[PDB]
Design a protein around this ligand. Structure first.
Ligand SMILES: COC1CCN(c2nccc(Nc3cc4nc(-c5cn[nH]c5)[nH]c4cn3)n2)CC1
Length: 297
C-alpha cells in the first residue's frame, strides 16, 4: 500500500476566534469561527467541532481520514487544536446540511439545483472510491452546502478502507461495507433530495427494514421524479451489489440529465425560482476574509 503523506496541521488556540455555537448534540458542540493564521493578513471562516481517552481516539480517527482527502466535493480538515478537549477545525459551510436546506427552501429549489447536487455527490463519492475509502454513513444530513451551487460530502468517523435506513441489505445482515454499499446510501440520499427532505421509511422501525428490503420493497417514486430518475434510484437498491451503478456512471447519468433538467424533474414553477448566488447583494468586520478553498499552503 501507498504511504499516506498527508500533513496534519496543529493550530494554536490563539490563532482562531469562536464567534458563536451552530449546534449541540451527542458528541459535544459545533461552533462558527474565524481562523487568523500567523501574520498572514487572512481571516478564514471556520467550523470548530468539539475529556475521556475513548472519545479522543474517535475524534482523532476522523481527523486522520479528513486530513487525507482533497477534492472540491469532499470536506478536508484544516487542522486540529490540541486543547484539553481536542477539536477539529474545518471550512465553514455557511448554508448548513443539504437535508435541512431542501426542507427550508423547497419553494425555490429547481430541477437544475437537484440534478447538479446529484452530480456533485457522485463526484465526491467517486473520489473517495479512487482513494479506496468507504464512507459507511452517506446521507443528505452528511452533505454540506458551501453555496446553493456547491455541496460537499462530510462526516467521516465511520469511514474505513448504525444508519439502518441508508444501508445496503448486506450491511444490515452481514456488516459488509463496500463502495457498492455506499451506492445504496447514494440512492437514499437522492431520494431525500427529490422528496425535499422526507424521512425514509417513515414510521417503520429499523428492525423491520431488513425484512422489508428482503421482500422486494423499496422507497417510493417521488412525485417530481420521472421514471428516468427513479430508475437510477432503484438500480442503487439491487440485491446484487455489482448490479448497482458505479459512481463514475452516476456522474455521467446525472450530467446528461442536468443538461435538460425539466425533461427529468417536473417541478411546479421551475426556472422562475432563484437561490442566493455569490453575485448577489450582501451574500457575504469582513475585510481580509478568504474562503478555505482559496487558502492554500
Ligand atoms: C447539531 O447540528 C448542527 C451542526 C452544525 N450546523 C451548521 N450550521 C451552519 C453551518 C455549519 N457549517 C459546518 C458544519 C460542519 N460539520 C462538519 C462535520 C461534523 N461532523 N463531521 C464533519 N463539518 C462542517 C463544516 N461546516 N454547520 C448547525 C446544526
Amino acid at each position: 500500500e501507498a504511504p499516506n503523506q498527508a500533513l496534519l496541521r496543529i493550530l494554536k488556540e490563539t490563532e482562531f476566534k469562536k464567534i458563536k455555537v451552530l449546534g449541540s448534540g451527542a458528541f459535544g458542540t459545533v461552533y462558527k469561527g474565524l481562523w487568523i493564521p500567523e501574520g498572514e493578513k487572512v481571516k478564514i471562516p471556520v467550523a470548530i467541532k468539539e475529556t475521556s481517552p475513548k472519545a479522543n481516539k474517535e475524534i482523532l480517527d476522523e481527523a486522520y481520514v479528513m486530513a487525507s482527502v482533497d477534492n472540491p466535493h469532499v470536506c478536508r480538515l484544516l487542522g486540529i487544536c490540541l486543547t484539553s478537549t481536542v477539536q477539529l477545525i474545518m471550512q465553514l459551510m455557511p448554508f448548513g446540511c443539504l437535508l435541512d436546506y431542501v426542507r427550508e427552501h423547497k419553494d425555490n429549489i429547481g430541477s437544475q439545483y437537484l440534478l447538479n447536487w446529484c452530480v456533485q455527490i457522485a463526484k465526491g463519492m467517486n473520489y473517495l472510491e479512487d482513494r479506496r475509502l468507504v464512507h459507511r454513513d452517506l446521507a443528505a444530513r452528511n452533505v454540506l452546502v458551501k453555496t446553493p451551487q456547491h455541496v460537499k460530502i462530510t462526516d467521516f468517523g465511520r469511514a474505513k478502507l448504525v444508519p439502518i435506513k441508508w444501508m445496503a441489505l448486506e450491511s444490515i445482515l452481514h456488516r459488509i461495507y463496500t463502495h457498492q454499499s455506499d451506492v445504496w446510501s447514494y440512492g437514499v440520499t437522492v431520494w431525500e433530495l427529490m422528496t425535499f427532505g422526507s424521512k425514509p421509511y417513515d414510521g417503520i422501525p429499523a428492525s423491520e427494514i431488513s425484512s422489508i428490503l428482503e421482500k422486494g420493497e423499496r422507497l417510493p417514486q417521488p412525485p417530481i421524479c420521472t421514471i428516468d430518475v427513479y430508475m437510477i434510484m432503484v438500480k442503487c437498491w439491487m440485491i446484487d451489489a455489482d448490479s448497482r451503478p458505479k459512481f463514475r456512471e452516476l456522474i455521467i447519468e446525472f450530467s446528461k440529465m442536468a443538461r435538460d433538467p425539466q425533461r427529468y424533474l417536473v417541478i411546479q414553477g421551475d426556472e422562475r425560482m432563484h437561490l442566493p448566488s455569490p453575485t448577489d447583494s450582501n451574500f457575504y468586520d469582513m475585510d481580509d476574509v478568504v474562503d478555505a478553498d482559496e487558502y492554500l499552503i
